[PDB]
């Protein structure tokens, strides 16, 4: 394996580790925050979907990417082609249209809720436990946003190390265009 | 939270991390070893089930434990009761009866196959890749065996830190008896 082709694979791995991390945080937000607050009636659903969005849709969306990459990973750990997955997956990031279309309206409830004693108490409890796992609740919207805005860099890095005569060149070039379109359809 | 009750939770966590690890190795054995060798006809299925057993059954068996513990884990990360899961799960370790009933017959093929050039070549390839993940193929049977023999220690450690008047005391006491029975039904 060449030094360059090792970077190509390292670039593909860097990306999927990013997905594992997003998924861990989306699940944590669903389990430790959203569901309990909804259950204890600390916040109404209308409110909780303003803050968190459709977690129930995003989690299997990003898991789906990770599944497909894993299935394309050989026994030796390398992945030969990836463009065909990305091109046919990226358009699904259009599932964020609604959530991210009012980041403005989101940060008006957010700032309201940080005076509520019932949320303060809920967090202080969660946080007192040495087995709890923290999320910055007040800038949650940053987690997905950060990730969505990172894809073009991740894709350009895979392409930087893709051999001239490789099918991924066209597909990755076309995927960078897909990601760029999807971004404008929410900002 | 008391110093003792922190140990109880640490004991429960230690156990589930063990399951995550076993699962990672059972999946790796299925993906990097069993399936490819079966596909390339380096080994017949009869042979591969002697070496690896019914991976397809063990993986969802241990995942099932991890699912159920996760569902019993509160937002704060602690788990209040665990005996009721363990008592009703442990009898399923009886799915190892067949595999482990001929550890003797297993280590006669094993020692045969380590002279086969086709297996040597297959491994040397796998291993040459910097993205590959290693398993000691020749003492694979140790991975499950080690784990099965570790449960009684894991259970006694949870019980060591369980409060006198807690429902887990009876259940864990009864689970230790279940694990002990299951072990004799294969050794």
From Swiss-Prot, chains A, B:
Localisation: Cytoplasm; Nucleus
Tissue: Widely expressed.
The protein's role, per its UniProt record: Acts as a guanine nucleotide exchange factor (GEF) for RhoA GTPase. May be involved in activation of the SAPK/JNK pathway Stimulates genotoxic stress-induced RHOB activity in breast cancer cells leading to their cell death.
Signals that turn on the gene: By TGFB1. Up-regulated by DNA damaging agents like H(2)O(2) or ionizing radiation (IR).
Domain of life: Eukaryota
Protein name as annotated: Neuroepithelial cell-transforming gene 1 protein
Organism (species): Homo sapiens
DH domain residues: 7-187
Shown residues in whole-protein numbering: 168 to 354 of 596
Coiled-coil ranges from the UniProt annotation: none
Subunit-level organization: Interacts with RHOA in its GTP- and GDP-bound states, and with CDC42 in its GTP-bound state. Interacts with the PDZ 1 domain of BAIAP1.
